[PDB]
Amino acid sequence: ILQTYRAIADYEKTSGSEMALSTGDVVEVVEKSESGWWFCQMKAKRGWIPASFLEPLDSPDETEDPEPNYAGEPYVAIKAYTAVEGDEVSLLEGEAVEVIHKLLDGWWVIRKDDVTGYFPSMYLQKSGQDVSQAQRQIKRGAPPRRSSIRNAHSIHQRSRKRLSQDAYRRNSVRFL
Incomplete structure (x- = not known):
């Protein structure tokens, strides 16, 4: 003290x-x-904040995201979510998906059918687990996306690297 x-x-x-x-x-x-x-x-001054609203100081690229796993992991929606942007996936509670990229900004890339898009990691649970436990682990809403910012202000002239949904899809359809 x-x-x-x-x-x-x-x-x-x-x-x-x-x-x-x-x-x-x-x-x-x-x-x-x-x-x-x-x-x-x-x-x-401390608190929980959206990773999406942050950038690193030495480069626009995150250093600790896990690599994509095109084979995928089976997960299910434990909370329904309505798509507001064209690169997001709408799901009802109960729908099964395959997670292929667990990005640290909370919006994971999932495969459903043969297309890919983003979905809040907080609203997913690995298949066959206790849904109630996932739901109680939710203590605030999904983080806002970086895409929800009208005009972001960066210290880097280079843009951060992130595959388009089409690129994710081309990899996804091929590497199962």
């Missing part, structure tokens, strides 16, 4: 070696000094 203190007045930085304070701010004291200048930090 670091000690937590509170600011009783506004403090403006005079040097780049300082932190500004507003009355009421809450800080953790890292180092007290008899100089009267103390090294402190603001309480960390």
Whole structure:
């Protein structure tokens, strides 16, 4: 535990070696000094956010997505979902699909019939498991897609690499 203190007045930085304070701010004291200048930090701001709204700093490409598995894994829809974009797949609860790419943004590529499209990983469960358990593991809605952003702002001029649904399909129909 670091000690937590509170600011009783506004403090403006005079040097780049300082932190500004507003009355009421809450800080953790890292180092007290008899100089009267103390090294402190603001309480960390944390929370769950959509991966889709993030990009890495050294390149637009995610480094930890698993590779696609064209053979697929059998899964079933444990919550119904209506397609809003042309690269998504509509499913009723109970429909079986094959998952072929478990991307870290929550929108997995699945095969149904002979076409591919995206579907929320949160609304799928491996075939033959306990559906109620999957449903209780759902604690918020599906993450918004990057495609849902009207105009995204990136620090990279290169676009991130992601196969089109047609490319996924061409691989999918061939590599079972």
